[PDB]
Amino acid sequence: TSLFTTADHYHTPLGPDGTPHAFFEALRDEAETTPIGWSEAYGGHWVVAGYKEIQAVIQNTKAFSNKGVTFPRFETGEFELMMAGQDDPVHKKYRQLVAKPFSPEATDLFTEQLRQSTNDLIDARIELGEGDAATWLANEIPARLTAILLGLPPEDGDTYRRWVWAITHVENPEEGAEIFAELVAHARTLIAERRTNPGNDIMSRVIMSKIDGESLSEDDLIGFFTILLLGGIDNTARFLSSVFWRLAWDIELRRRLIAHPELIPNAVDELLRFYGPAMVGRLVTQEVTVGDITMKPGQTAMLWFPIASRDRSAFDSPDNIVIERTPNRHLSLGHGIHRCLGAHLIRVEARVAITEFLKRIPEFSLDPNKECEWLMGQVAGMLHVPIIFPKGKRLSE
Ligand code: HEM
Ligand SMILES: CC1(C)O[C@]2(C)CC[C@H]1CC2
């Protein structure tokens, strides 16, 4: 028997702690013998679990295409995820258009805005002594930042979350497609507005950009809008939710971050290794052998980053959160030409969120009378994290 045979990133067995990590540890153990295995899920596909094997696949862009970046494919109608859904030479030209606004200097500009937002959000429930850290904080900090990056109203987060849920999880395909079509209608209106009144934001930037002398198509612009929306509302929210959950019960980790705030950035990196929400797919375009396995054109390989990030041949003591770990070359943000555009931004966001939360609410715990819930999928992490804490004071009003 093999754990690969029924591996399915949308249906990972959960342990008594509520996470898939016992299952990830068991699959990591099996991957020491068999680092790539066949899953019968989704009609049959390859599951790549060893660290060196994921590296080999993800570097081999001639055989492994980002046309398969989401598997099963995210619901984005006839549109594609810009950059993430493309291969070179096209990929490189599009990524060049937005490299500057995601540079460390450009994203550092938002540090105090995130700090103020985190505190304003905390203000909303600190007097109540209870709240869902996911829906109250982890969802809202990136949703508001992302609305700002895209030049959208920050108070409409539930609308944006409804779109992202349709893209990633709504099971009825007619419903899903129709809600994504609502995103498209809103993006069209935004694009038209920015054409006449261009702002400082990233949409305005790509709308005014040119490639090889020509302006981008509306379809390309909607692809930019969609992937940047997903990065915040999905990936970042699920990561931060998992982090808040971990800090709620792991009183040892928590006291060390409070005693040593200078270790928070390295701790964020180690939490990214351990709770990194993402996996990605690759479409096989040429016959290719990786280790013992020969893959054929039209097959898909799923890169199970959480398993590789636990590989004993790549990390010492991989099942422990070692906040001083370095160089920590985990695969949670990918590797090679598609490595996460938002890497610096999410590091700033996580550092500020953790720093301010632990400053305001150093004492808290999981609510014994409400359930936590892990969301499974290509982007996986806590969805509900009910916590309790002593009632406190607002900084404002
Ligand atoms: C914890 C949060 C995040 C995680 C774990 C994450 C993870 C990833 C991963 C694994 C990839 C590689 C894709 C591949 O190899 O096919 C990637 C690429 C990408 N990410 Fe992130 N992401 C996060 C947040 C964000 C945010 C906040 C943004 C932007 C607002 C963003 C924008 C992008 C883009 C545009 C790409 C494609 C880059 C390219 O294809 O060259 N991500 N991300
Ligand atoms: C799932 C994952 C990793 O996140 C986004 C934002 C980037 C690459 C893919 C698809 C969308």
Side-chain angles (χ1 to χ4, degrees):
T1 62
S2 176
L3 293 172
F4 286 95
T5 307
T6 55
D8 181 340
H9 47 294
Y10 282 81
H11 299 283
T12 55
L14 304 178
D17 63 316
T19 76
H21 285 177
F23 169 69
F24 287 176
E25 289 161 20
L27 186 57
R28 181 273 318 284
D29 291 347
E30 186 178 340
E32 295 183 350
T33 299
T34 304
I36 302 174
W38 185 255
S39 171
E40 294 195 13
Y42 303 110
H45 72 284
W46 296 106
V47 169
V48 186
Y51 185 99
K52 78 185 181 294
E53 287 77 17
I54 289 189
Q55 284 191 138
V57 167
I58 213 168
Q59 287 287 135
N60 189 354
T61 58
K62 66 175 303 202
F64 292 102
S65 170
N66 267 57
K67 284 299 168 53
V69 59
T70 62
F71 179 81
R73 185 189 177 74
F74 281 6
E75 177 56 73
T76 61
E78 265 120 45
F79 301 91
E80 301 170 63
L81 300 178
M82 226 72 330
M83 299 168 284
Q86 298 162 317
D87 299 319
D88 285 345
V90 165
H91 160 263
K92 177 184 255 265
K93 298 180 190 183
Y94 284 69
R95 182 170 173 141
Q96 281 174 334
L97 298 182
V98 292
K100 287 175 117 58
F102 284 96
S103 66
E105 63 200 88
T107 53
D108 281 343
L109 291 181
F110 302 118
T111 306
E112 299 305 310
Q113 169 191 310
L114 286 158
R115 194 186 275 77
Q116 189 65 63
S117 172
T118 302
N119 277 296
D120 292 347
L121 290 165
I122 292 168
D123 277 356
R125 302 200 65 92
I126 192 174
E127 289 181 348
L128 305 179
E130 53 72 40
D132 189 321
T135 70
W136 160 41
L137 296 170
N139 287 358
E140 290 282 342
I141 296 165
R144 287 177 183 265
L145 169 62
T146 301
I148 299 320
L149 294 180
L150 297 175
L152 296 165
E155 292 292 341
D156 242 293
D158 288 322
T159 292
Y160 314 140
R161 280 181 284 275
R162 175 162 174 277
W163 299 340
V164 169
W165 188 254
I167 295 168
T168 59
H169 289 283
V170 162
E171 276 303 283
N172 183 310
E174 288 173 319
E175 285 176 24
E178 112 93 60
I179 294 177
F180 180 74
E182 299 182 44
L183 175 159
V184 173
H186 282 242
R188 283 185 179 130
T189 304
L190 183 281
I191 291 166
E193 289 309 321
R194 296 306 182 203
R195 282 203 174 110
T196 75
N197 190 40
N200 296 329
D201 64 283
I202 304 183
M203 286 308 298
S204 297
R205 181 176 180 87
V206 293
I207 287 160
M208 299 300 162
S209 293
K210 293 125 190 304
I211 289 176
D212 297 346
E214 200 53 55
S215 71
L216 295 183
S217 69
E218 205 189 55
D219 296 351
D220 285 351
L221 294 169
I222 290 163
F224 269 107
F225 182 89
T226 301
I227 186 170
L228 302 175
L229 196 75
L230 288 163
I233 316 310
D234 196 13
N235 303 24
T236 306
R238 297 286 67 75
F239 172 59
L240 295 179
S241 295
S242 293
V243 169
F244 285 133
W245 173 82
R246 179 62 183 231
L247 289 172
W249 67 261
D250 190 346
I251 60 179
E252 175 180 84
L253 173 60
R254 192 198 309 157
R255 62 166 176 83
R256 288 170 181 161
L257 297 189
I258 291 170
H260 289 274
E262 77 279 359
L263 258 21
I264 287 167
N266 217 66
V268 163
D269 198 43
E270 177 70 339
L271 290 160
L272 270 174
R273 180 181 71 86
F274 207 83
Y275 289 104
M279 299 183 197
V280 300
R282 295 292 189 262
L283 171 70
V284 179
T285 63
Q286 17 171 97
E287 185 180 297
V288 54
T289 299
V290 189
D292 296 325
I293 300 305
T294 299
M295 305 183 182
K296 305 190 291 195
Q299 291 177 340
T300 296
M302 280 297 293
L303 309 183
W304 278 53
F305 296 146
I307 315 303
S309 292
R310 290 169 165 80
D311 190 322
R312 291 183 182 103
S313 73
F315 303 90
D316 287 356
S317 305
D319 292 335
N320 290 268
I321 297 177
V322 177
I323 60 176
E324 68 269 28
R325 191 185 300 271
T326 187
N328 200 359
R329 297 205 263 249
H330 62 76
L331 296 172
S332 294
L333 301 176
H335 173 72
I337 66 165
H338 295 281
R339 193 175 184 274
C340 184
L341 221 221
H344 190 79
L345 181 60
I346 70 104
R347 291 183 189 284
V348 171
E349 185 169 7
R351 180 188 85 238
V352 169
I354 294 170
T355 297
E356 296 307 302
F357 189 77
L358 293 184
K359 189 171 179 178
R360 298 286 303 278
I361 307 178
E363 341 139 79
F364 60 109
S365 64
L366 296 175
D367 189 340
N369 294 315
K370 296 185 171 187
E371 290 292 307
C372 292
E373 182 181 11
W374 180 274
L375 181 68
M376 306 175 288
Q378 200 171 324
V379 176
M382 286 297 185
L383 188 65
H384 290 292
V385 187
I387 60 165
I388 54 170
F389 48 88
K391 297 174 189 177
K393 323 300 191 76
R394 303 166 76 106
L395 300 185
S396 294
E397 153 109 85

